[PDB]
Amino acid sequence: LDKQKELDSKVRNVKDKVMCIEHEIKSLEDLQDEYDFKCKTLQNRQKQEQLLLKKMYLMLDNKRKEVVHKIIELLNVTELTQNALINDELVEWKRRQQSACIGGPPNACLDQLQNWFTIVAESLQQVRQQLKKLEELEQKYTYEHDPITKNKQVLWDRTFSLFQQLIQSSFVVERQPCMPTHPQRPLVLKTGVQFTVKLRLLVKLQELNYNLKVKVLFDKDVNERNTVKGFRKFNILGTHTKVMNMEESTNGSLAAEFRHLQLKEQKNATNEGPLIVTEELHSLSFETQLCQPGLVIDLETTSLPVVVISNVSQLPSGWASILWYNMLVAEPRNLSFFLTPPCARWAQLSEVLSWQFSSVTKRGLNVDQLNMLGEKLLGPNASPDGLIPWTRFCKENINDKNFPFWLWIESILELIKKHLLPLWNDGCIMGFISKERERALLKDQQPGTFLLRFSESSREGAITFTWVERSQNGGEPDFHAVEPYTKKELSAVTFPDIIRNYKVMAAENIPENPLKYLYPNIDKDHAFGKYYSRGYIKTELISVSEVHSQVRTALDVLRELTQQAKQLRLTA
Amino acid sequence: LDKQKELDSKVRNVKDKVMCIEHEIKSLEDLQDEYDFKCKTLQNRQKQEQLLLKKMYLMLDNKRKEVVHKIIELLNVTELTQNALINDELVEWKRRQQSACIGGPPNACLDQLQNWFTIVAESLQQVRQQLKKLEELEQKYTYEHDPITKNKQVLWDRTFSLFQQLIQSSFVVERQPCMPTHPQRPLVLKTGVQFTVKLRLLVKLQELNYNLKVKVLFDKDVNERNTVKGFRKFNILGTHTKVMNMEESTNGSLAAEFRHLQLKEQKNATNEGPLIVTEELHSLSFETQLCQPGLVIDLETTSLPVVVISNVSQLPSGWASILWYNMLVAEPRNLSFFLTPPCARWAQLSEVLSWQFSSVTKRGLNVDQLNMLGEKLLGPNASPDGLIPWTRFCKENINDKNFPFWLWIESILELIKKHLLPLWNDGCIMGFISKERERALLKDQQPGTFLLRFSESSREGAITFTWVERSQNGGEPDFHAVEPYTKKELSAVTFPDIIRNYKVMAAENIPENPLKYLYPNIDKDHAFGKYYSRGYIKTELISVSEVHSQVRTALDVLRELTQQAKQLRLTA
């Protein structure tokens, strides 16, 4: 399952190959020196020894031929490992970085990648040093068709182009733009709020500590700003530059954290646009440069596209765009919406929805909840291939409703985070359930039994219980749900308190709590025990329902008032 | 009732007197000129005419004697009016300015005072001009015992000293220091919050527009800072200066509003103090100077002492100190507490308490509410002479309680402002009533009847209803009060809603609302009508009391449960 094992070996092999080369060049100059030594002492005037100086010559030429073969052999294996490193392992990191940012499983450490990039780079610069001591031996001693001279140039050019792009691709945004004051929603930034972003260089060469300075550019190289209509122009406030180093990081990595960076719009002084503000993407790019003796390398990375918003109202709308982006696109195309947004497909939305909950809460969406939502978006066919347009997700109002899909679940999340967390996290809430299934689950259940479900018609995001009562005829019983509770109500008293002291009352009758067992036949106080709040007359504060027309209570008048309704509007 | 009528006349007389003087000096120089004219033409050589030039001489001397008498007569009436103006009318303004700032009736306009100060000052400078044209005539023509020369110096010195202190006393703080973000609580300022203060000069002389610049000094000339132990040292942030003018004001007055002034403490780098922070007073003083041709006047006014606090928690505690100050002291003594704070007396506290409500609300304390509070502080004797120590007001906890008096009423005010305003403002709340009177008012009342009273044991500040039920024996009925409601509860549902849907309930019994009539036999829904809030099952949210042991309801089991208590612990 790990191509890491083979990659470790290749770069091990790379390190192992440069080191023999270094060993063989030492004896190459060792013999180069005694050839000059012998050939010079013999010139200073039957023990021929000219047979030796002819052999010592051939060794030198063979040895030269050998290390030139060994270097090109190495440049050929390192071309193969970098292609893997840069074009597989690193590319896959970046995709699972955009999965992680929007709710996926956590990303691994950059450290395996950094370790790979590093010793490849460390080998790539030892070869540079070897190519240069070979040059020292070439002009101390050359001859016809010197294998040093015949490969000197393209060996030099091959190591650099490799080294150049290697560290060029090493320039990664380790942590994407993210307003700390809004931690769980990166890539969306509000004018006047500071955000942070951390760049990293994976090659980790001590020679580079405090030697690279990164500039931040907003909307660099914009054809879209003057092509697309009404594009908004912004500017970065803060230190636009920062120098990389290794002690600020705790892991010793070479990075440059732009803390305290903020964004404000231009003062151009309105126009219409085919792309609404949250649908409009920008990008934050970064530039640095490696000036060393004789060589110059230009580095340029870019963050994932960001959405900028005017006020916190636009936070959930914007985050839909982020999600649609990193769900589908893997490339920074700032026109991905335009008005060509791809429809997503349920097999992906299905679990990125599940992510929005496990990231916020400690519990994700289950299959039964996913079928519910599936049907709401697609229909009866719960097909993984199901195509979910972007308009049906955040633009057009869902089905026969007056609010879009995503915002309906954002505010459900809101509510769960702020009021329903331990209930939801313990799995007491069967919140995602159509009214059709809702009924069919309780139909053959004890009349004390209920279930908590989220309302599909509350824009502000509410929860409600549904219970079943018997209805003259044994089959086709009576199904009741209370008006669902928004945060306004649960701020005043928690849902577990509401459930326990709920009363159905009626003029001149005993109140009684309809709710007796939660769905799998579990007693109310045994189910919601741990979630309860727990000289004058004490007073408590409770939700109640007056029906307004054991012994006869108010649910006995509830039963009668609804059969009278059912016995009315009968056919004849 | 108005000494204004006589004052208007005196300063009218003052203006009327300078104007005849100006008329008489014109003919004084008119005749001075023809005396020189005749006496010179006669010198240029039986129609004596030396009889004329002897008479014209006597007129001049008499006229001179006359305007010197008329000026000293005026300087004598203006000494009398300024003493009134500066030492009565203005002093009384300043006392009713400190009454107004802390809840008294609104203060009048400075405009009558400004008009007085002005024409007195305008007269005082026309006299200066007259004293100077007299000087012009003196050296054109003098002689033995010239009445001009014999009074010239002290006339000059009398007009200036008068003019000097006149405008010196004209330097008033028109609007006291007051954090706008805390409007109803001036003289208390929090470090880092801007406050405003407006100085005014009442003399209103166009010559002075944009010609006076006022500096603000904090704690100027402090013997107390190094005498009293642990005194805190602060500093003003902002423009410390500002120039007076007349167009910034809308009434055309000469004033200098220090907007955007703020305060921060020193960085001396803890000690103990006999005076706690809110008990510690400071003062903000102001300096300006009148540099005109030949004369220099130094002006120095001071605001009422201010309390500085670290955070809004100290706002109600500090305001007690302000109140105790401007209730008793009329002079800016910054040690008024020290540990010699005077006891206030009920005849004053009584209505300054009533002020705290009519300033906040639209309704003050009534006699019945005042007797209540009187008794709580003093006792059975409701004497106006009653001495109320400062310790019993904000320092030591009231009676057998764990909280001080004043803060108990601040949080009642808080509650009324934030939850009970229209109830309180319509006089539906009999909130100030001991339990003893509370009972004795309902004893002979219908059993549906109740009354709303403030709890005397709620530090956070709560309201509750008390109703009466019949109790086997007709006399000595049953008195019930619910645990009183803090703001936590009334945020969730308003008190009028709580009252209407209040239910006493009990296991297997009908609920019923005990509350049927408010005290003067007024039906619940007819009393609290206007204050009510007014496909699932609807739900509402209501306060209830389970007694936990027409037809038999839950107040019938309430009645039985309390006689069983009363029938228990009986004597034998």
Author numbering:
A (entry chain A), B (entry chain A): 136 to 180, 192 to 415, 419 to 683, 700 to 714, 742 to 764
Original authors' sentences:
Signal transducer and activator of transcription (STAT) proteins communicate from cell-surface receptors to drive transcription of immune response genes. The parasite Toxoplasma gondii blocks STAT1-mediated gene expression by secreting the intrinsically disordered protein TgIST that traffics to the host nucleus, binds phosphorylated STAT1 dimers, and occupies nascent transcription sites that unexpectedly remain silenced. Cellular, biochemical, mutational, and structural data demonstrate that the repeat region of TgIST adopts a helical conformation upon binding to STAT1 dimers. TgIST binding to this newly exposed site at the STAT1 dimer interface alters its conformation and prevents the recruitment of co-transcriptional activators, thus defining the mechanism of blocked transcription.
Because this structure was of limited resolution, we fused TgIST-R2 to the C-terminus of STAT1. In crystals obtained from this construct, the peptide bound in the same place but was now visualized with much better resolution. Four X-ray diffraction datasets were merged and scaled to yield a final model of the STAT1-TgIST-R2 structure at 2.9 Å resolution. TgIST-R2 adopted an α-helix and was bound in a groove between two loops formed by the SH2 domains of STAT1. The density of the two loops, which are not clearly resolved in the structure of pSTAT1d alone and only partially seen in monomeric STAT1, are distinct in the new TgIST-R2 bound structure. One STAT1 protomer shares a 551 Å2 buried surface area with TgIST-R2, positioning the helix deep into the grove. In addition, hydrophobic amino acids in TgIST (i.e. L383, V385, and L386) are positioned opposite to the hydrophobic patch formed by F614, W616, Y651, V653, and P663 located at the bottom of loop 1, and L664 at the bottom of loop 2 in the STAT1 dimer. For example, R387 on TgIST forms a salt bridge with E618, and a hydrogen bond forms between T381 on TgIST with E661 on STAT1. In addition, residues D627 and H629 in STAT1 collectively form a hydrophilic surface on a small β-sheet, where D627 forms direct hydrogen bonds with T390 in TgIST. Hence, the altered conformation of loop 2 in the dimeric STAT1 structure exposes a surface for TgIST-R2 binding, that is otherwise absent in the STAT1 free monomer, thus providing an explanation for the specificity of TgIST-R2 in binding to the dimeric form of STAT1.
